[PDB]
Symmetry: C3
Subunit: 114 residues, 3 copies
Amino acid sequence: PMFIVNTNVPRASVPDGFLSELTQQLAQATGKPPQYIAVHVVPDQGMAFGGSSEPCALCSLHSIGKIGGAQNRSYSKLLCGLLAERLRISPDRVYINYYDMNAANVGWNNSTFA
Amino acid sequence: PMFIVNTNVPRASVPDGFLSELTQQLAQATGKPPQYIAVHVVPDQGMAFGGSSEPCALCSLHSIGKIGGAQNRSYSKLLCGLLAERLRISPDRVYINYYDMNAANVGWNNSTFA
Amino acid sequence: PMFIVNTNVPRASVPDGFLSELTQQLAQATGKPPQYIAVHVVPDQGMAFGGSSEPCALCSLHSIGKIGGAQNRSYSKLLCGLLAERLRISPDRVYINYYDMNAANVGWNNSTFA
């Protein structure tokens, strides 16, 4: 699985530890070994939400399965919680797009997961 | 709706007010309320289009509904128009990927739009 | 087709010519003229793979068709090979998401490809 965060919060406000924290919390939440979890956080971005440049985040979670109605509500609670606590972003200024990827459509190690 | 623009145009050449103009014109085009529109502009990117480093852009528009054949033609004319006028990028060096997101696959405010 | 690479490899470790090499190699791989290929390389990223900040990449390939089981295995071998050779990233530290776009969902030059 892969989780990408894009945010207008400054780099200095992103805690050391945050990438590892997301890795651990996603590994637990998705049920997948942490070895497969990739995380990417992009601060200092030129973005607006609702026409305002108050702290916000645009995120994506891609997984091969483990994506669906209730699972996504649960990931949204977990991930908005982490963003509010660690980056001080209001949950109502966060979007997370969820992508259920086909195994044949994810490349890794010179091949795919199919 | 969420609209992201990645470009090799330098940050000094993105005018004041561009994020606000995009938010407004996206609200005019999709008819969704401005309060829910997110916009993100990433300049100074290492990009080529057709093997050339002349000004170009790669963009994405995600929306829950309001995506389709004639709608996306209308969005493309609006958005290439804004990129040409404001960032001086030729329309034929712009790609925009359109994504019709399932409400259940969009997280916000600790939950989803389901 | 559009190929995007995000990596923690530093800018100075990205060799001259890389965007043209990726344009040429993807044009031959997808059997399309290079005038259609857009490439985007983003170094210096705050990212981890499996909880480690060793060199890694998160990439996307979007195309109108030419996306499938065998085709995606072939693109992964080519692209992991280029990232290992040029950026010194281990193939088992690369994810590539593949997207078969419908023509109606790709904007270009004030309209779509539909």
